[PDB]
Amino acid sequence: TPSMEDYIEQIYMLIEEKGYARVSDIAEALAVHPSSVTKMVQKLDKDEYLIYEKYRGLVLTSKGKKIGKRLVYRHELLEQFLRIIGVDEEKIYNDVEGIEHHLSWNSIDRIGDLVQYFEEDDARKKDLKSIQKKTEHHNQ
């Protein structure tokens, strides 16, 4: 599920940055109703991605951690990608949040190589940028 991936990716980030995370952290983070969060967490608990105890709070199972880290890698690769090709900083999160779920892993890998391509030599970055310049010259 697409919103599943959002939850897993989000819970992953919440645990990582806060250590302790709850249903409230997810709600706030996703701007969703906590009751809806609970229902989701329960399905996730059922599919054995996580564990939601008292003193424990949310804890990702070994399986949740592999997937979660994969989703986090994917999300950040997409941001870097869009940033690299010149998308306006303000547009990135939104676009990345939508497409991340409709890209195959085979594509995610090709996007990875593509980022490497530009990352290993600025000459390439300047040639790409110069295309954007001429493309938008009628507005400068």
Q: Does the footprint of a second copy cover residue 42 (CB under 8 A)? A: no
CA dihedral 7, 9, 10, 16 (to 10 degrees): 140
Q: Does the footprint of Mn ion cover residue 75 (CB under 5 A)? A: yes
- Residues that contact a second copy, how many (by CB under 8 A): 31
5 is an annotated ligand-binding site residue: no
Q: 34: burial class by Cβ within 10 Å (0-12, 13-18, 19+)? A: middle
3-state class (DSSP) for residue 48:
coil
Single out the segment in contact with a second copy by CB under 8 A; choices: 8-16, 27-35, 66-74, 103-111. Answer: 103-111
Subset of residues 54 to 93 that bind a second copy, contact rule: CB under 8 A = 82, 85-88, 91
Q: Which does 6 bind (CB under 5 to 8 A by kind): Mn ion, a second copy, none?
A: Mn ion
Query: Binding a second copy by CB under 8 A: which of 113, 126, 139, 140?
Result: 113
Q: Does the footprint of Mn ion cover residue 67 (CB under 5 A)? A: no
What is the pairing mode between strands 57-60 and 50-53?
A: antiparallel
Subset of residues 9 to 38 that bind Mn ion, contact rule: CB under 5 A = 9
CB count within 10 Å of CB 101 equals 14
Residue among 23, 49, 30, 129 at smallest CA distance from 84: 129
Q: Which does 75 bind (CB under 5 to 8 A by kind): a second copy, Mn ion, none?
A: Mn ion
Binding residues for Mn(2+), by number, are: 6, 9, 75, 97, 100-101
